[model samples]
Target chain A: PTYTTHHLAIPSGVTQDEFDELKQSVVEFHTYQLSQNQCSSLLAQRIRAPNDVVWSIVRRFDQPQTYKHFIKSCSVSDNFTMAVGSTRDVNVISGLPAATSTERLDILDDDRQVTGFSIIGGEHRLRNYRSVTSVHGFNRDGAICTVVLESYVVDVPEGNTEEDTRLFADTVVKLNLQKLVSVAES
Target chain B: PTYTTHHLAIPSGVTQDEFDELKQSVVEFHTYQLSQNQCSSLLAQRIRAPNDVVWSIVRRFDQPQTYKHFIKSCSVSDNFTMAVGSTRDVNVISGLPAATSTERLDILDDDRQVTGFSIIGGEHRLRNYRSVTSVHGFNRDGAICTVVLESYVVDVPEGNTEEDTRLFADTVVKLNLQKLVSVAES
Candidate 1:
């Protein structure tokens, strides 16, 4: 499958059924209340790859080092493998001061192409942070079309909005998708 | 100003800049880690109306009867006004059962066009449920484009997944938007 779309907007040539499916596939945020201290964001995009190709990159729990440009390094906390309850320490370079976050592999569903984790400990302002990423595959004119869903929630600091956190996640997801595209295309 | 679009999909005649803004306006779910307890869902849609028109419908906090088809009745607890700490009893008719939920008006931000509430006591399966709705305004060929964001979070049942709860929230949000659109356009 060839990657043709420039952004996450639904491609123009898709059928009505395909468009409906894609529209429904878009992530729905269920917990953002104004002045409620917690906020959530959902970022979705289409990739030019199959579920396996996308899941391969996602299954490597300790391998943000593989697809994320902002992740400088990553290491597993226990027996150097990807599984639920396994924790990992990651060094990130998100154009801010160098920081670290220890994330617990909360869910790793291979059959459903869904993976999830939570930041249990980190040198960051975001508290109670949880994240989930999923991939779904569809046929696009005989090519594999993948839909990627990235969702997260965290405690926003005083005097800020979800948009502040949404923008941060948006940039990270976009870059990671670009890196995944580069790897799959190569 | 005129309503040119039929659905949430970006209008074809929208400018590149407007499209970019609309794409960015789409919610990105960043903190939806699977399992281990609670789950969150973010549902957002853009309507063809000014912020004031949308906000007017929203500001009528004591008037779900104005827009909600399933809301058989609504009443405030104390003085029956939209103030922080106000509580309301809402009767719903969603085809399943006759039920009532007592919700606390947790936050109301007029400056930001945002309002939030939480289900403190209810006969529902969802526990620890909270919801927020916000409206943002943009300009499209002299027409007012309003982006409405509704998000909520709740605990998942033993046999269910986050997707289950997500679909429920999605149906309610879409229906509410449909009602809101009907009112504003009228």
Candidate 2:
């Protein structure tokens, strides 16, 4: 099992009844879990690569570096399996199950434009293979929390959605952690 | 005391003893509490807001939105006051004191190319008031864990370093109420 944390304020509008109703609706999906096929020998090897050789060899096939980077962004399951030789057969089992809602809103003084990335999980460390499937938040104070979800074509039942998982890795890196950051003084 | 959990794997050449020693050093600094000033108010506020203001505010102030789409990427801190507000009369106070480190190799591979952000004291909050200080980190899997005192050119001590107390107000909205996260679907 993996551990992660998210901190946010509960909205004010929902009454006790509405809260219960919303909770019930959310319970319908139950957070995602790993499938037997998803957690196979390949997964175990990659997840617990006693070393990076497994990672390096897997990437040798075509563009193993890309997969290596992909795994870096995702939350891996307890089990892992590395590919043999130059086979890009390492398994990737997600900690997040199926589709879940992750949303946020932001309020600004003027109606202008904003450019940034959305961390499907939270502001940072969208790690933890098993965490919230989706998040619903508002960026602007008073802005209603919108449902940041996987578009219909991508929405399916499984662990972390392919899109959210990819976005979580790419967005935060490009947006949050990249800013106000620099190479340590040499 | 703040709690942080991390997993470390012994590299190929590292003995179990060496890995254990590294953990002792790494965990000591990585898990310790960040002084009041070491964090950005914008960061704290963004994390705690009901609407996820941090991510949005950053985006709002980014690109052609404000000035340059970027600034020096470093965690900032201060030991004195910085001006705020439109007229710049509101002098923001410093928050706290501290230093910490992490083997943030994974974060670096995420395109950040940063090792860590070292704060001198309080990190400035105002949009225009750029605090004079140095932020350091590097690209390396191993760095010695230690603490030291650096001499200062502009001398002043004993001040509130974290001026953006207003930012964390909503952070504890759930406090200890929501401890365990649950996911279920049928």
Candidate 3:
């Protein structure tokens, strides 16, 4: 709604207990320590795609623009790889508050279906920004579907309200997750 | 001098009037409109080297770490050339507070003996950072010597004092100019 708080979307026809269990895995990997001067939130989405199919797209550390809605281009460093410690320079789409983001991979656990990166530098005000993304598989009427969760923490920029910063980041993440669903389901 | 204010070091034996005229050129190229939230300063240095030699070093839009003391490596975005619009990723030396700096060349004028670049993105907090450098020749004891001037403007980082920002930026510029002096003289 307002994007000032975190929200979760359960797949249709899922049992309440099933979503509760899935939420546990999401929460486990998305936790971050917040400071008085920082703000953070989590957003979750469901995709009508199998875990392997979604993970194939999500594990692309060198090509996040494939699913990230705002990123227009992503040029990774050093010939590029999906391994940890890789870096990338990504330019956001036109008509946005931020123009560029320089990021470094912090985690890439393939078996766990987890990925993470930190926005070390950019032409915007999101300072000390870090994000973790994870995917899980659930059975839906004898078919497998995937749920993705992304959580982020960023320093509330000076002269900007925490609500404004939190809401902006959420909108971007939500739009990117929706794009991810589009690409994976197709 | 703690770098709280701008300073000019006139070449030895030159008339104050000559310096008064040279100061005009440096001031003309280094001018910037300061916002209420930004800080800026100018620094001047004299090199016992010819103008072309100094200009050769200053015009290297692709190679700034050649004389900048803090930079350990400078990797241009493309094949790299001494042309406007070129970009570079320079990593600072070990033990510095800042690690990486991404810059774009905005001006590279050989006829005018001036060059400039803007730090578009980096892991550091030097937001909206930009600098202009100029080289001038003067007659000294039947030989030509150089005076290099540099000036920069940057947003005062959140939680950092204007005094601190000004001093830090001035120190970096001053050190780089000193290194330029060494390289040109040798």
Candidate 4:
């Protein structure tokens, strides 16, 4: 029954009221409907850029390697398009723990600013891994600020505790999110 | 007090239930809050691309000149950033009615998929020109589809009737939107 919200600081240029309302609205980021054998965590970050600018970068299911620092390169299947069932072959950067990943696009709702992908089979230990990222945009004075909330659920590895699994996943996602901010901020 | 919906066809990939719910939720596209001297209209178009794809193109306040067939070029104020009250100077294509325009950004909400701008001073009779474009995305089976709803409110010039103004404006927006679709689809 426990849930968490990471990166609690309000984004700059957002009004107090806007932050409060957005914070309350992020309950969806909570309550991921996780199960006993599963570990889940949520982390959010704010980018001082227009939502669409950030979205255009994130929605590239076909070309995720560009901004995803961990991904050194990727090539989607010829039959795979940016759709729910489409999948990609992702190669991790040289220093990462895993060499490659086989992932599938489970959700890609462009209008809603939401995209989800799950690891199917890869040279990694993350079994049954699933992640969802949503981008929320609010006006900052006249500038637009975007908040990205990423949530992931995975079956804890046999040797790791839920806390350890969750922390590791959160750390990785937070790093990736930070990298995403820099890409969009520019 | 009357509002109209254009491009009534449901996108090819949307299920009936999804279409039904989306139509019901479009009440926001209604109630533009126009006055007697002002005329308002809403038009929707289905883009066979992800919602983010269409939005990225639409949200480029600095570069509207690219997709908009009538706009040949635009340059924001040297000091202007993309923010509320920021303005951009635009040059129309050679055959258009007006040569240049000054427009201001009024609303830019990424989370809500809404962006709006109002013309400040332009070499045209389309006085007090304001337009708001909103993007809606939904899962289309396994693919993604986007519907863009653009609503505009403008003061009817002395020589034009409400119907005349609406028809002319609607025609222009439709042409522009079709061009937008062609750009985003690829």
lDDT of 3 by residue, A17-113 (tens): 6667766765567667777878888777788899888988988988897887546578876677777888988876433322688999999988889
lDDT of 4: 0.72
Task: Give the runs in model 4 whose Cα sits over 4 Å from its true position.
Answer: A1-186, B1-20, B23-25, B94-98
Docking class of 4: incorrect
DockQ per candidate: 0.01, 0.02, 0.01, 0.01
> For model 3, how does the per-residue alpha-carbon lDDT over B57-172 read when each residue is reduced to its tens digit?
98887778788755656786557776888888887642322268789998888887999999998876789998998888888899998878788988886676776677667756
A31 Cα displacement, candidate 1 (Å): 8.1
Q: Pick the candidate with the highest TM-score.
A: 3
- How far residue B96's Cα lies from its native spot in candidate 3, in Å, is 7.2
**Ten contiguous residues with the weakest lDDT in model 1 chain A:** A1-10
Which ranges in model 1 have alpha carbons more than 4 Å from their true place?
Answer: A1-19, A22-35, A94-98, B1-186
Count backbone overlaps in model 1.
25
Best by lDDT: 3
lDDT digits (tens) for residues A5-110 of candidate 4: 5336654434567667666545654345566778877667889999999889889888876666456468876676678998888876422222678889977887
Model 2 chain A: weakest 10-residue lDDT segment is A39-48
Share of native interface contacts recovered by each model: 0.00, 0.00, 0.00, 0.00
Q: Model 3 scores what on Cα lDDT?
A: 0.75
lDDT of each: 0.65, 0.22, 0.75, 0.72
Once model 1 is optimally superposed onto the true structure by TM-score, how far is the C-alpha of residue A87 displaced, in angstroms?
0.8
Q: In candidate 4, which residue pairs clash?
A: A111-B137, A137-B111, A142-B83, A142-B84
User: Distance from true position, residue A82, model 1, in Å?
Assistant: 2.4
